[model samples]
Target chain A: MAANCIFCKIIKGDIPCAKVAETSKALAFMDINPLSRGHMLVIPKEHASCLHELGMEDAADVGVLLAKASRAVAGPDGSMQYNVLQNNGSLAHQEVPHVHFHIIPKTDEKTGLKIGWDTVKVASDELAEDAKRYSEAIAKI
Target chain B: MAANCIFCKIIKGDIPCAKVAETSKALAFMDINPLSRGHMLVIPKEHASCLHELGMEDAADVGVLLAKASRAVAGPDGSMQYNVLQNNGSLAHQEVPHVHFHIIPKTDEKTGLKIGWDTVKVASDELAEDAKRYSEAIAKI
Candidate 1:
C-alpha cells in the first residue's frame, strides 16, 4: 500500500469509514462529504495511483463491486439518479492520489453534484485523424 | 437491439463515430464535443440503459476498456490528467439513455469538465445507519 494514503489507511483500519460493501479487492464506503443522502465511494483495496495501473481482474473486481455499490446507493426503488465520477491527478480534481470512484446521487439542480460542460467543436477532419492515432495508442497500451 | 437507440445504431455502423477502439462487447470513440484535445467515450455494445443493468462480465468488459481508453487519452508521456464521468438517468444529467463512459482530459483550470461539489455534513449516526442498510442491500443485490 502507498504510504500515507488515506484510502490505504481506511483499508488498514487506521482510518474509520462508514462501510458500504467489501470484497477481496475493493471496499465501498459512505462519503463523509456527501453530495446527496447516499453518496458513496468505491475503491480498490490494492494501491493503484489510477485506474490504468490496475491489473485486469483486479480492475474487474472493482468494477463488479462498483456495480453492486451503485445499486446499493441508488436504492431499490430505482428512482434515484447518480453520477459515477473518477478523477486521475490533481488537474482532474483528484484530492487524494489513490483511485476512488465517487457514486454521487443527483437529487436536484442545486443539491447534488453540479457539472459544467464547456466543449470545443473540432474540425471533422482533425477529429478523424486523432481518432486514428488514439485507436493505435489504445492497441499499444 | 433496442429500436431508435443511438448507441445501437453506432454499433451497427448506421451512425458514424470517431472510432478509437472496439472489442467484441465494447466500443471507444472520440467525443464529438471534446472537453480537451483527446477526450473520448467508451460504451458497451450490449444495450444497457445503465451500469446497474449490465451483466457481470459485460460490466467487467467496459471497465477493462475504460482503463485502456483512459491510458490512451492521457497520452504516452503521462502528463495529462482526465476525468471518467458516467451518468445514469435524466436526473443525473444523462442526455442519452444508454450507458456510456466519458473520458474527458483536464487541460487547464477552466478548459475541461468543471465540477462543483456542495457536500452536506451528514450526522454520524444517520450515516452509520444508512451504511448498514446499504451494505445489506448490496448483499441482496
Candidate 2:
C-alpha cells in the first residue's frame, strides 16, 4: 500500500466513505467532490498510481467494476448515460496518486457534470444522501 | 465483426487508419477527430457497444494495449501524462456504438486535450501529422 494513500485508507476503513460496491480486487465509493449526483470513484485495493501501473488483471477487474458501477448509477432500466474517466498524472487533473475510475452519471446536456478544469467541494449532507442512493442502486446490480 | 461498424471496417481494411499498434484481439489507431495530439483509440477486434459487453478477456486485452499506448505516447522518459476516457452510451458523448478507449496525451493545463461538453474537429492534415508521430512512438514500444 502507498503509506499515505487516501484510497488505501478508505479501503482499510481508516477513513469512512459512502460505500457503493466492493469486489475481491476493487472498491467503489461516492466522490466526496462529485461532478454529478451519482459521481463515483472505482479503484483497485492495491497502491498503483495509475491504470498503466495497475497491471492487466487488476485493470480488467477495475473495468468490470466500472461497468457495474455505471449500471448501478443508471438504475435498473439502464436509461441514464455516463462517462468513465481515468487520468494518469497531474497534468490530466489526477488529484490522487492512486488509480481510480470516475463514473459520472449524465442527466442532461445543459447540466450535471461538465468536463472542465474546475472542480467543486460537495457538502457532507448531500454526499451522504447521494451515497445512500448509489449504495441502494449498486445493491440492485 | 459488425458489418456497419466503422471500427470493424478499419480492422478489416475496408477503411484505413493511421495504424499505431495491434494485437490478436485488439487494435490501436489514431482518432480521426482527436482531443489533442497523440490521441489514439484502442479497440477490440470484435464488436461490443460497451465494456460490460466486451467480456473480461477482451477487456483485459484492451487494458494491456491501453497501458502500452500510454507508455508509447509518453516517449522514452515517460514524462507525458494522459487521460484514458471510455464512454458507454449516447448521453456520455459516445459517438460511435463500438466500445473503445481514448488515450489522450496531456502536456499541460492550458495545452493538451481539454475536456468539455463539446469537442473540436481538428484539421485532417494536422491529424495526419499527429498520427504519424504516435505511429512512430508506438512502433518503438
What tens digits encode model 1's per-residue C-alpha lDDT throughout A8-111? 99899998877788888888998888888878999988888877777777777887888787777677787778899999988899988899999988878778
DockQ of each: 0.76, 0.15
Q: Candidate 2 versus the native: TM-score?
A: 0.73
Q: Against the true structure, whose lDDT is highest?
A: 1
TM-score of chain B of each: 0.92, 0.75
Residue A55, model 1, lDDT: 72
TM-score of each: 0.95, 0.73
In order, the Cα lDDT scores of the candidates are 0.84, 0.67
lDDT string, candidate 2, A21-128, tens digits = 676788876665555555667899888886656765676677666655655665546677778888888778787899888877677776444554322243445444
Off by over 4 Å in 2: A116-141, B1-3, B116-141
> Across residues B1-141, which tens digit of lDDT does each residue of candidate 2 receive?
377789989988999655566777888776555555556678999898766566656666676677666666654466778888888777777778898888776866765555653322434454344334323332332
For residue B71, model 2's alpha carbon misses the true position, in angstroms, by 2.3
Deviation in Å, model 1, residue B101 alpha carbon: 0.6
Instruction: Report the error of model 1 at residue A77, Å.
Output: 1.4
> Lowest summed lDDT over 10 consecutive residues: which window, candidate 2 chain A?
A132-141
For model 2, report DockQ. 0.15
